[PDB]
Structure 1
Amino acid sequence: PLAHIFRGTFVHSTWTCPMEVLRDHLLGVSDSGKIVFLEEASQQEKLAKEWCFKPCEIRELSHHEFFMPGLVDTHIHASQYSFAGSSIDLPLLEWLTKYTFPAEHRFQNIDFAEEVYTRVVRRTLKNGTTTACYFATIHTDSSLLLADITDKFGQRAFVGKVCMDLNDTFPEYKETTEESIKETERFVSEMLQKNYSRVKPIVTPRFSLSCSETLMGELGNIAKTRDLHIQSHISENRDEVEAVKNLYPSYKNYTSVYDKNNLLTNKTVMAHGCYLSAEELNVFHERGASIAHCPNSNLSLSSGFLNVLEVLKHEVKIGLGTDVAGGYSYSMLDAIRRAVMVSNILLINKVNEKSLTLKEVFRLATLGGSQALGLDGEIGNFEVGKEFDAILINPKASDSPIDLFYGDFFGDISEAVIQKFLYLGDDRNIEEVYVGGKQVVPFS
């Protein structure tokens, strides 16, 4: 029989509605993990007959609790979690030399890898991140452990062994071209041998500055021949953009550097995208490539602003990311709030005529990012057929950061309680986390 039947309010997004609130509904989850039905509780009779369950098998949620889809982190450096909440005081390129490269260099030690990676998987899960797209480090074996660790905890993920054969400011932390290609192939081969249910390898050129043309082309080939996803960074910072102009002056723009070396495909996510032009956004659209909007990082490192309205105008797929540790928060709730705020910055400065609503950003954090990752057919909202990736919100949880009032339920501020959670909530309101139907939080 069914693994779960839930009764209560369900808050999710569709392609035509940024936030649909489905009150007093019944959702059934199969033994395999799929949403098997979702209907008004009025159908409890017809559904108990169909699906052969007794009413005492229904779990009824508290009247002030709601389920929402698990949050989808489309860009996060697992290997930088050690110093997250720290060190956001140099712009990207100097930041990388001083903090990031020495940090990821520690991962040659596999026992150090185990500590940091165990903490970020658990930390991100307890904050409702059910799917993470991870940058690991250049070390295949330590990166393989990250995959093993996400499997062990039941997080859905892409794990990416980072490829870098150029590193002038910290030459200790790099590979040769040959080594980088051979180790990517070993990483992918050993990942696929594990046959994990929901952790996949992702082809991870660090970015143009770190990768020769040979490296980039070959990584594009591994992606194509093996039919794999690609992640990298693009156009985050102005000095980065100039530094690519001067390292790669034969290419019209940053997007072209990747495009012509076969690293801009329809399974490609690119972090940041702040200085992509309209023409570059057209090519993303044409290639089917996605952007991870990382607004905390973009403010914290003084990089810039992604104009998300324009990305949507161009019909480029887009999710939200945390980008730990350039963005200091591990929480996709922070990513949501920061995304709202950055859309407000562009309104204040008269770049756009409107800002983004909280519900639209909620949709980016869940359904949008599921699409940025090509996983929108299995996750991102509550559609029959989909995996049950879900977080249970109780805004009146023990020690809750939220104060609820009678007016939040009976006054004139529409979905006041959902808003209070999205703006003020933390992991204390996230009572239960589900991935693929199984309860992964609380931890055993």
Structure 2
Amino acid sequence: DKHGKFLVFFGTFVDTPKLGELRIREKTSVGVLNGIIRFVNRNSLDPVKDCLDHDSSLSPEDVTVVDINNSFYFPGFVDTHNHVSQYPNVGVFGNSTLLDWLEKYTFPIEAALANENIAREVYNKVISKTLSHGTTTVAYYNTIDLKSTKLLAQLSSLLGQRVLVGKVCMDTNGPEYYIEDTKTSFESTVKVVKYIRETICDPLVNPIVTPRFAPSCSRELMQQLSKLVKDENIHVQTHLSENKEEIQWVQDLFPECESYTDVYDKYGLLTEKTVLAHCIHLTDAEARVIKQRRCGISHCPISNSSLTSGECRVRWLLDQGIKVGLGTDVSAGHSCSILTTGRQAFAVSRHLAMRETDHAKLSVSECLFLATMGGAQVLRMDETLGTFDVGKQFDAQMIDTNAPGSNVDMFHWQLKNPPLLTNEDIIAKWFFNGDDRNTTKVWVAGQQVYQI
């Protein structure tokens, strides 16, 4: 436990303060106290003295130095969309697309997690696994079950991950074994919000109102949830414009509205803290509404490709000023890793560029931005998360490209006559061939929550 202890981390710090930038700070000291970065000193010669210069009140006794050539600190990844309850089905989907996959795999597994013994095992596994891949902040969809959603929030608090935890709302178009009535769906949401805020009462654990998607939620439910969201200033998360059959269904179910996006708009769910997953098939008018309402988009490339949903037009969304982050979308996406997700965002953008010009491509640094600051923006936490900057939370991971078993390797003669690698090249090697085995330590709010 590091509360009350002044920390200073010394070494190389890599982050992405602006889309397209990759900031690499060598031989740098980062002072941290009670989870908050207090200073960042490049070319630091004396990390302890940097702390004493920063605060007259300190003595050398009060300072803990943490010392990092092939290693660097990187911010924690932000997973803006993850159905923790679906994790038993990662890799399991066959030839199916969205609506068949929901019926065949997803409602069955979510219903099964009403068993607290199963749910506890799944939650412990997913929180620990995502942390081990460097995910420090995650927006979780759970299930319609109040009690299991409360357990997920409790275990999140215990294990030290930064989370938003949602009870899924479904009062229409679900199987009889896995559906709510309207009053229960609303009242259970009120209870979970109060329980998280007043009982769990942990700055790292937030509620989030979670209408599953428009086919699952009546107009009455959406309007009731809207009012709660407004009155209590709560995050919202839902799916939008993922699959062509889904979109046709929404049009058939809500023909009084102009579009899928207009359904959420008219029934009050589009806010500055609304996280919209997928957003593939949007019209220009829909994207314009999203921009105007200041919602954020969770780009889920692994799911989108795996379920043959489509290609998210990430550059087109960014070009309009919409904030975009990455989501794993477990289990439609098979991976718990936002690094894996970033690699697939890179690939998807090139499938689009094959037809839509090079403008559509995302660079390595842009994908790392989406994986960190982008997700922080989508969660309206970018003032406190996503980079190594004064005043922000020390949510961070240690990357060691020479960790045991690493698939990232570099020959001595490549390191600064044969061609030499830049620092940027080293980061790219981790981006493409790194995995969890290179994440050796993870900190959330300046507390070490994971050790390899």
TM-score (norm 1): 0.96
Tell me which of 50, 53, 70 is aligned to 1:49: 53
* Residue correspondence of structure 1 range 58-77 to structure 2 within 5 A: 58-61=65-68, 63-77=69-83
Equivalent residue letter for 2:36: K
Q: What secondary structure sits across from 2:252 in the alignment?
A: helix
* Residue correspondence of structure 1 range 184-195 to structure 2 within 5 A: 184-194=189-199, 195=201
Q: Once the two structures are superposed, what CA deviation does each residue of 1:37-62 show, in whole Å capped at 9, x if it has no partner?
A: 1111346355443344549842221x
- Which piece of structure 1 moves more, 80-89 or 431-440? 80-89
Alpha-carbon separation, structure 1, partners of 2:193 and 2:94 = 33
Q: Relative to 1, partners in 2 of residues 1:378 and 1:19: Cα closer, same or farther, differing over 3 Å?
A: same
Q: What secondary structure sits across from 2:398 in the alignment?
A: strand
TM-score (norm 2): 0.94
* Residue correspondence of structure 1 range 3-402 to structure 2 within 5 A: 3-15=6-18, 18-30=21-33, 32-42=34-44, 44=46, 45=49, 47-51=51-55, 52=58, 54=60, 57-61=64-68, 63-168=69-174, 170-194=175-199, 195-350=201-356, 353-402=359-408
Alpha-carbon separation, structure 2, partners of 1:206 and 1:323 = 13
- Which piece of structure 1 moves more, 313-322 or 51-60? 51-60
Alpha-carbon separation, structure 2, partners of 1:92 and 1:208 = 14
Q: Indicate the RMSD between aligned Cα atoms, in angstroms.
A: 1.6
Alpha-carbon separation, structure 2, partners of 1:395 and 1:372 = 29
Q: What secondary structure sits across from 1:434 in the alignment?
A: strand
* Residue correspondence of structure 1 range 405-424 to structure 2 within 5 A: 405-410=411-416, 411-414=419-422, 415-424=424-433
Q: What secondary structure sits across from 1:303 in the alignment?
A: coil
Q: Relative to 1, partners in 2 of residues 1:53 and 1:84: Cα closer, same or farther, differing over 3 Å?
A: farther
Equivalent residue letter for 1:38: V
Q: Relative to 1, partners in 2 of residues 1:58 and 1:273: Cα closer, same or farther, differing over 3 Å?
A: same
- Which piece of structure 1 moves more, 80-89 or 328-337? 80-89
Consecutive unaligned residues of structure 2, counting only runs of 5 or more, are none
Q: Once the two structures are superposed, what CA deviation does each residue of 1:260-288 show, in whole Å capped at 9, x if it has no partner?
A: 11110001001000011222111111101
Alpha-carbon separation, structure 2, partners of 1:107 and 1:67 = 36
Tell me which of 392, 410, 425 is aligned to 2:434: 425
Equivalent residue letter for 1:113: A
- Which piece of structure 1 moves more, 333-342 or 52-61? 52-61
Q: CA deviation at 1:409?
A: 2.8
Alpha-carbon separation, structure 2, partners of 1:85 and 1:5 = 41
Q: What secondary structure sits across from 2:189 in the alignment?
A: helix
Q: CA deviation at 1:406?
A: 2.5
Alpha-carbon separation, structure 2, partners of 1:216 and 1:89 = 32
Q: Relative to 1, partners in 2 of residues 1:312 and 1:153: Cα closer, same or farther, differing over 3 Å?
A: same
**Which residue of structure 2 aligns with residue 436 of structure 1?**
445
Q: Once the two structures are superposed, what CA deviation does each residue of 1:213-264 show, in whole Å capped at 9, x if it has no partner?
A: 0011111111111110000000001111111010111110011000011110
The percentage of counterpart residues that share the same residue type is 40
